Amino acid sequence: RFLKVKNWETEVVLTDTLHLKSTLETGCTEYICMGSIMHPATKDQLFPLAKEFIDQYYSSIKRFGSKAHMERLEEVNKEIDTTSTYQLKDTELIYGAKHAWRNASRCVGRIQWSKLQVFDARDCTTAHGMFNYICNHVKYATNKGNLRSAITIFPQRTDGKHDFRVWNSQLIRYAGYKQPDGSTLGDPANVQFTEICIQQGWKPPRGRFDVLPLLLQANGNDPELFQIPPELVLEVPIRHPKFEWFKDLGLKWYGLPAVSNMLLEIGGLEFSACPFSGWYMGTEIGVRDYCDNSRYNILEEVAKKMNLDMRKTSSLWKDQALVEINIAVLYSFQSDKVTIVDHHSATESFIKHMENEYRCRGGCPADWVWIVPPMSGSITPVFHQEMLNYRLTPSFEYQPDPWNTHVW
Template sequence: MRIPSTRTVPTRSRTAVVDSVWSDAKEFLTQFAQESRGATDTDRRLREVRSAIEATGTYRHTTEELTFGARLAWRNAERCIGRLYWNSMTVRDLRHLHTADDIAEQCVEHLRTATNGGRVRPLITVFAPDRPGRPTARLLNEQLVRYADDPRSRQRTHLAQGLGWTRGDKDFDVLPLLTRTGRDDTPRFHELPSDAVLQVPLTHPQYPAFASLGLRWYAVPAICDMALRVGGVTYPTAPFNGWYMGTEIGARNLADTQRYNLLPTVAQLLGLDTSSDRTLWKDRALVELNLAVLHSYQQAGVTITDHHTESARFLTHIEREEQHGRTVAADWSWIVPPISASATPVFHRYYDPPNPHPHTAFVHHASAADTH
């Protein structure tokens, strides 16, 4: 018989945790006080938080702090070109919810609210942080909406089918939400209602035959495999979205060879010479595929932006931040669009390097990506 260990966690380890949380909390709350009109009596608030962290190892944000923190995490997202809109994100504070059923239900509501009839709203829904004895259910999906036939979704599709999901055999079948409450719990699936997922059929303004390909994509790119970290507190389940830039769909999701790999199909439809790479058939097919995406979303009345417009707006964002005395960290390889790179202004400059340890950020965490 194995005897349970009675060894306690060394005091130094607990002290290190408390010091780490307090350090991040102090930096965040100081920044909140500097930038937010809602901050009052910062010294008293810091004393309250310090006392809570020493007693429990964590603390609770006010709604105003959480709202600022979620928006700040977007502002700090060095791989996002759409940060000009960071302060417009709507924050749904649902920290009182932590069960799988409640989270699935409110993720559906997130999609409906964010879709907004096609006028997509930047939105984040923040569920409860973990507490001792009460873990918050995780979403195992990469995004709230993904397709079962997308090669990137293969593992999650198999997981859902193994749990009893009976779909996934048709093109563009929408995956269910996958949740798990603890690492040892069996995952569960939750079907997304069709009225919560707005999809756009893809057509081309000059090639009517393009519609025969039967392509589509969804309106809201709601990321859910990242945790929200705000001033030392981590919210493991916090799906968030902006709106699509056309190249995310046309140049990556539909064109990447490890995804839908549609460039050969589009080239054949357009009658392009594919005998040699030097005919630039891939480039021509890529442009037409991206044009189809932008055209289709515009025709459907669904918010989308193009890479030229968004590149110019990103430089506007940098100018605004510099006017406030703030630098903008950016990952060049993500900011520069995947097509026509040198034709956009973001290509022709360098950026401040990312902060390796920001106190407030969206971060990948293993439990969200682990679908085994």
């Protein structure tokens, strides 16, 4: 069946044919939908997957059934036979990484999908090696404010035992500190991890915005600590254009969003260490990081300085403070010439992207729950965009947190 998606603001209908290509699961069934749940190999399992991916590769470069296509299939089988795995060609690495991005149902930034710088770190063997590759990534992608999308890809999983893992969930995050008095310094969501670094020898500057060091595991070994050189870590001070007292709140944030805990899957190979990075949508910092109760939780403070009536919730004081906070973040980043996108422009870009995808690909998997900004939802166009969600490969998937699996 061909499936139709409607936009309820423009009454545009698009026809999804793409979903017929998907093979992974979604977690839903005919009777139970899990749309809001965050998280729902051997020689024999590994070949057809390999066959599938090569097939869509030579399909995407107009050489299906070609001579080059055949020998590649030949190469792969013989290689899976005698090593229980196989190694991707370069061109294949780039395609697969770009396509996992293109297939990432939760990313609103996919208009950018084909413009991705891929770093091949498959020759890496040590944590020192990784640190090096990551630093170069961070510097390339940060580019002095003019952010560029990138991904760095370390050796594929072999036997589970000798996995490569960046332990930090993101390349750049602030430390969180448990205080005797029950409160918490810095980012509360990182306290456990922060505690693992102190427990490893990290001398923590017990501050509010301390850049956690890198914890890098190479080839199944003990992870090792590495402080990223401060000159490569770009932070932005947050100020407000009308409220001169906003800089007194002392807020900064890093400019480079780089996810490092996900697993990139291509033709049945598992790349358990693939830090990737684009640039920030304002709301991520402005709404989630700053205003989640489980996070930096600044609303109450900001609402004080704004002199709002905080007695009853129906003064929408929280809403007011939230808006001004996000104005600040955009203003700061913009003033510092640091790439950032506001949620209106990012969502617009997404609807345009989505139209493109249907036009040339026959669909575009999308997770409405993740795509719709965490504030001002129905005033962005994706709120009114029906989206079909489904899982295409290559893809980014979650994996266990390393500290729940590794033996020392």
